[PDB]
Design a protein around this nucleic acid. Structure first.
Lengths: 623, 633
DNA sequence: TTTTTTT
């Protein structure tokens, strides 16, 4: 038999265990390993999971086949093979790739569906085990763990450009015009000492030609250690993850990705020309699988029922921060911002941007930043920042030599942005934010490097009052202390002030004391509400209608009677489109525009605000 | 070229004595041989390293002297050439190694499986270092002298090379852990035989040519291939120890010294704490090209053997002794700054801050800090700076800082790749700010970013969990009754709310107070001890603080309702007490939180499993005393 | 590169 070196386990036996997993292993085995028999379905269980997966790979036309170490453990012989893989991940992965190819050929013949066995041979099946082990940081990874299968979660610090890889060397003889191809094993090309052609009779006549040499796609992605894995006292250590073929560019940089792989250690040459290599070995992880960290039909039905409920707007507001008290209007504005307005692009007038930015000002103990962290959790992509920690250059763009790097707002783009101590945030940073928010995109010019980075990020800001506690005598805008251009740029302005009464104090103290009374203590689940916002954006594309247009023109003229920025009217339209997404209405309606204007009026306590100078009586706040 | 010089030492007889000591030496005075037990643990692979005590060697030599047999002076020969003696010690450990009482899990050890296979195929085949999975170490000799006496970097000399020696100083930096190929294993396909190469240098040249007799018999020129699973690898870390400030002569800068820490000893150190490490001082060879220019001049380094940083049943017994002494809260308060006379309430608040309150994190995601922060506001000459320095010395990880001496950003995290600031050095400790009134509000904003939420934001982030203490002088240098208490504090209401408690002390002439303070101070001057209650030792005080922190008391329904009533009362008292002369700041729900943390700290000091209404009332009384000190005038 | 700070 053929045995992997040092394992005393046959490579044929590993392939046979993988074949028993691919066929003659029921999905019932994986479901039983998962237990939860009430959750498992008997018919899909009786069907063979890996047989269905190989047939699905044939239907896709792709050689790659996702692998589950849990399913490998579910099958008994495949569990033994998975332990052998944990010992020798690369060898067992090659064995499983060959087994997947052979099982695909056998499955094509068995199903009798049209397919080419030669096409299956040309295809190189891929085994991508996952759930082999608990996710761990790069700092947790060890040289003993090198050459052992593991599943790792990490946030991509950056993704490197695709790196050419010498899949096979090609030798072309300059003396005799001979053509040859030499496979590259272990990353080293093989060169015959004499000419491949005996008639040439020229020693070392063969010459490698790089263009003729076969190249396989390869890439690397820097991966930061997971925030839980990182030590509390120090920033996480980062190790780049090797990737190739379909795994290359599987996940974009700046988004969390879970890549199962085998850790690798390689000697580092003391000098590139010198054969000598330092006793220390550089360490990198080669990913057997790449994964992240879209609405299911049942989730979409649940979102539809929720959106049908009239209580759902306030329900999602409360669901953003279920434990928090008395900031439901700010949470509703944040939920509208998470839904976002629809974006319209035109040849003239540029492109109206649907993304909504929300500014919130609260006196200390407003729980505004607790709600902001709640919004960061609720957002599908979360960016949280402190005003003292915020920098304008970091928010817009950085340069490394000389190539531009994504700003903090650019990384926020594609998700909601959370800002704490927004009053403490620098006015210069806010001035940088003004242009980026007005354009919904960032443009940067600098010596050497000048480029524009997308900044289409919904922005949430939690701000202190300009006074240490919010002053009713102070104007609400002054208490928020936001610059007027940034306030116009923001779609929504939120004002929250504490109101004191004996019964209200009893209620607040009772809430805090109940959370304390538990030793560990209508709201949608936060993940379900993120999915609801995603489904609202996906299946709802609100646009200005006639009724919404009557409401919008009335609101614009009335706010001009009250001065109305044209951007505020666009922000009201975006909030109206956000409300239609919150209601899962395909187009903006008069009720949506009315709710958007009502949400803006309630957010800044404009109804509470006194008619003159914009100041709000404290009793008027919180009605 | 190599004139041999016979010396009064024979390595063979010394190694025989070492092997005899390994089997004969036992902890009978403390009570098979203890070294044999460690060898059995290593055979089971339960012990991954060995530490040979120099004091044990000296005791064995004393036993030999009592028996009349002449000692080979193994303990002193270690000081003579410890590097050379270490190889003999490893050989003696191999000779006296017992069989594994527990299975070594050889199947999981790919090296062990391949080693059995390689011996079978072969039937010093492989390096003994590759055979050994343990790292030797040397414990410093017990005081009763170069190894026993710690040294400064400048005090160390080139003659100390090749000698085990202890050093003392601040760790400037620690290099990142790197692999070290103790043995590089080369494999060639043409022979099918593995050829091992033992690397003992900082850099190595790969064999690059198959040395296998099978390849020699086949006449094939094989290309050796290194195998990570076959080659031995050891973690390598470096440390830079810099001379202590007292050890540095005036007008001289302390010198950091590179130290090699390998194997299990790697990653043992942290830069913040002073370390007393015994290690064989050894030359560091220069590279070829650099050595051609250096000439006879040579680099030097230290290979650490035993690492010790300055800062259970015994701890439990000490805490029980303090509890039996009783009144533990007031006793620890009076123990704080025994030389300082008075300010017992400030000392009690400082002890509460040292114990800290319970840190709470809600299931929804809310996190409320348990760390306590205190502020001291006093007139000049009231031992504000003295008490702050005493508290900094009391805190093993605490840092003392001045408002003018250090910038706020530098204290939070000093920009030179990020490096920990004074607050990061105060992690699991207390950052002290002397002359906090003099500190600028711009830096106070950086402090306010961290006081409310422990984490630091800059991008780079650190948890930066610590307790904050501040000492401030009143506006214009002294308290003015005409000025409101808030005006004399001259601090933002955000700072007042973030602080758990602020203490205001006034300098008022008094005949009896002057007489008592002069008596205590004159007693302190004539005799270093304070005249009078006996302060607890700082080690036992820190142990009691840790024991209190372990309690983590939780609130009850009655205590929570009483705290809610106190919050309502404080809010109403602020609403009615808008008069600035009597207004100490509006009631804060966060302040009641701070009050919750203080009650948790009091229940921790009392070691109560749950927070008590008495603890809540005591925290409220601390704040009330903070106001009443000014009210007395 | 990026503070730090002296001109």
């Amino acid at each position: 038999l053929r045995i992997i070196w040092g394992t005393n386990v046959s490579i044929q036996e590993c392939t046979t265990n993988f074949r028993n997993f691919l066929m003659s292993f029921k999905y019932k085995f994986r479901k039983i390993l998962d237990e939860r028999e009430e959750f498992i379905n008997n018919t899909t269980d009786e069907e063979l999971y890996y047989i269905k997966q190989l047939n699905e790979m044939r239907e896709l036309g792709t050689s790659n086949l996702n692998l589950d170490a849990r399913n490998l453990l579910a099958y008994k012989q495949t569990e033994d093979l998975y332990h052998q893989l944990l010992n020798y991940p690369q060898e067992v992965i090659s064995i499983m790739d060959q087994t997947i190819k052979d099982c695909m050929v056998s499955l094509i013949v068995d199903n009798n569906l049209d397919y080419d066995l030669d096409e299956i041979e040309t295809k190189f099946y891929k085994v991508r085990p996952y759930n082999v082990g608990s996710c761990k940081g790069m700092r947790e990874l060890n040289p003993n763990d090198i050459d052992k299968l593991i599943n790792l979660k990490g946030l991509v610090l950056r993704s490197t450009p695709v790196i050419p890889d010498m899949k096979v060397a090609f030798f072309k003889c300059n003396v005799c015009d001979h053509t040859m191809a030499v496979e590259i094993d272990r990353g080293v090309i093989q060169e015959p000492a004499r000419c491949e052609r005996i008639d040439c009779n020229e020693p070392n006549s063969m010459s490698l030609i790089h263009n003729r040499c076969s190249f396989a796609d390869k890439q690397v992605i820097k991966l930061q250690e997971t925030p839980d894995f990182v030590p509390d006292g120090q920033t996480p250590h980062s190790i780049s993850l090797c990737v190739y073929d379909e795994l290359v560019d599987s996940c974009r940089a700046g988004d969390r990705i879970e890549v199962t792989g085998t850790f690798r250690s390689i000697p580092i040459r003391a000098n590139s020309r010198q054969r000598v290599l330092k006793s220390l070995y550089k360490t990198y992880v080669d990913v057997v699988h790449v994964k992240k960290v879209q609405i299911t039909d049942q989730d979409l039905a649940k979102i539809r029922e929720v959106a049908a409920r009239e209580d759902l707007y306030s329900l999602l507001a409360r669901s953003i921060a279920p434990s928090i008290y008395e900031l439901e209007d700010v949470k509703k504005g944040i939920l509208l911002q998470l839904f976002g307005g629809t974006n319209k692009t035109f040849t003239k007038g540029g492109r109206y941007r649907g993304d909504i930015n929300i500014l919130l000002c609260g006196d200390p103990s407003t729980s505004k930043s607790q709600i902001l962290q709640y919004v960061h959790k609720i957002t599908p992509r979360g960016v949280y920042t402190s005003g003292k920690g915020s920098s304008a250059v970091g928010l817009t763009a950085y340069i490394t030599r000389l190539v531009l790097e994504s700003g903090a707002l650019v990384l926020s783009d594609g998700g909601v942005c959370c800002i704490d101590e927004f009053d403490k945030m620098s006015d210069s940073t806010r001035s940088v934010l003004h242009e980026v928010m007005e354009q919904q995109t960032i443009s940067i010019a600098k010596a050497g490097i000048i480029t524009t980075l997308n900044a289409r990020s919904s922005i949430l800001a939690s701000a202190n009052p300009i006074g240490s506690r919010y002053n009713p005598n102070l104007p609400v805008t002054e208490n928020i202390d936001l610059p007027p251009p940034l306030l116009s740029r923001f779609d929504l302005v939120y004002l929250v002030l504490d109101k004191v009464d004996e019964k209200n104090d009893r209620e607040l103290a009772k809430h805090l004391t109940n959370l304390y009374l538990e030793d560990k203590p209508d709201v949608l689940p936060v993940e379900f509400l993120t999915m609801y916002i995603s489904y609202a954006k996906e299946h709802i594309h609100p646009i200005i209608t006639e009724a919404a247009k009557t409401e919008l023109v009335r609101a614009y003229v009335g706010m001009r009677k009250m001065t109305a920025t044209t951007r505020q009217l666009e922000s009201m339209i975006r909030l109206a489109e956000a409300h239609a997404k919150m209601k899962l209405k395909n187009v903006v309606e008069l009720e949506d525009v009315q709710e958007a204007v009502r949400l803006i009026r309630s957010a800044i306590k404009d109804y509470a605000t006194d008619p003159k100078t914009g100041k709000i009586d404290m009793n008027l706040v919180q009605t | 070229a190599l004139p041999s010089i016979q010396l009064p030492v024979d390595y063979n007889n010394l190694f025989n004595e070492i092997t005899d000591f390994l089997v004969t030496f036992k902890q009978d005075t403390l009570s098979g041989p203890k070294y044999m037990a460690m060898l059995q643990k290593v055979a089971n692979r339960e012990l991954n390293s060995v530490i040979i005590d120099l004091d044990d060697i000296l005791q064995y030599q004393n036993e030999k002297f009592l028996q009349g047999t002449q000692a080979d002076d193994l303990v002193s020969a270690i000081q003579q050439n410890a590097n050379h003696f270490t190889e003999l010690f490893c050989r003696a450990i191999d000779n006296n190694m017992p069989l594994p009482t527990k299975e070594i899990d050889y199947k999981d050890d790919v090296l062990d499986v391949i080693l059995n296979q390689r011996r079978l195929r072969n039937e010093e085949l492989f390096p003994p270092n590759l055979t050994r999975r343990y790292f030797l170490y040397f414990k410093p000799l017990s005081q009763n002298a170069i190894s026993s006496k710690p040294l400064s970097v400048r005090q160390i000399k080139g003659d100390f090379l090749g000698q085990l020696i202890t050093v003392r100083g601040i760790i400037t930096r620690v290099s990142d852990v790197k692999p070290a190929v103790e043995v590089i294993a080369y494999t060639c396909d043409q022979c099918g035989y593995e050829v091992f190469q033992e690397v003992n240098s900082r850099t190595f040249t790969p064999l690059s040519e198959c040395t296998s007799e099978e390849c020699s018999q086949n006449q094939t020129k094989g290309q050796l291939f290194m195998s990570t699973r076959a080659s031995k690898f050891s973690a390598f870390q470096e440390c830079k120890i810099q001379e202590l400030s007292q050890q540095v002569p005036v007008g001289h800068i302390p010198r950091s010294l590179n130290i090699h820490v390998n194997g299990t000893l790697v990653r043992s150190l942290s830069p913040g704490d002073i370390v007393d490490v015994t290690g064989i001082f050894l030359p560091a060879p220069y590279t070829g090209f650099k050595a051609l220019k250096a000439g006879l001049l040579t680099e030097t380094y230290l290979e650490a053997q035993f690492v010790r940083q300055h800062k259970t049943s015994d701890v439990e017994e000490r805490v029980m002794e303090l509890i039996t002494s009783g009144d533990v809260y007031n006793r620890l308060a009076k123990s704080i700054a025994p030389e300082i006379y008075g300010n017992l309430d400030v000392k009690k608040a400082l002890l509460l801050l040292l114990v800290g309150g319970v840190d709470k994190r809600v299931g929804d995601g809310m996190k409320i800090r348990g760390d306590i922060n205190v502020c001291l506001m006093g007139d000049p000459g009231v031992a504000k700076s003295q008490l702050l320095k005493a508290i900094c010395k009391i805190s093993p990880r605490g840092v003392y800082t001045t408002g003018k001496g250090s910038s706020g950003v530098g204290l939070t995290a000093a920009v030179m790749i990020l490096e920990g600031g004074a607050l990061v050095l105060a992690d699991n400790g207390i950052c002290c700010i002397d002359e906090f009134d003099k500190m600028d509000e711009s830096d106070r904003t950086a402090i306010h970013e961290v006081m409310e939420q422990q984490t630091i934001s800059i991008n780079t982030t650190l948890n930066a969990r610590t307790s904050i203490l501040a000492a401030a002088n009143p506006l214009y240098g002294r308290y003015n009754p005409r000025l409101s208490p808030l005006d004399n504090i001259n601090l933002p209401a955000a700072l007042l709310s973030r602080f758990d408690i602020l203490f205001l002390m006034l300098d008022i002439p008094s005949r009896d107070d002057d007489e008592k303070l002069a008596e205590h101070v004159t007693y302190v001057h004539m005799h270093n001890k304070q005249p009078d209650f006996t302060p607890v030792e700082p080690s036992k005080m820190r142990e009691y603080i840790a024991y209190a922190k372990t309690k983590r008391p939780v609130m009850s329904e009655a205590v929570n309702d009483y705290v809610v009533q106190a919050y309502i009362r404080l809010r109403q008292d602020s609403k009615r007490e808008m008069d600035s002369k009597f207004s100490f700041g509006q009631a804060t729900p966060r302040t009641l939180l701070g009050i919750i943390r203080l009650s948790q700290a009091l229940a921790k000091l009392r070691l109560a499993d749950m927070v008590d209404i008495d603890d809540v009332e005591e925290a409220l009384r601390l704040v009330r005393v903070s106001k009443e000190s000014l009210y007395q005038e």
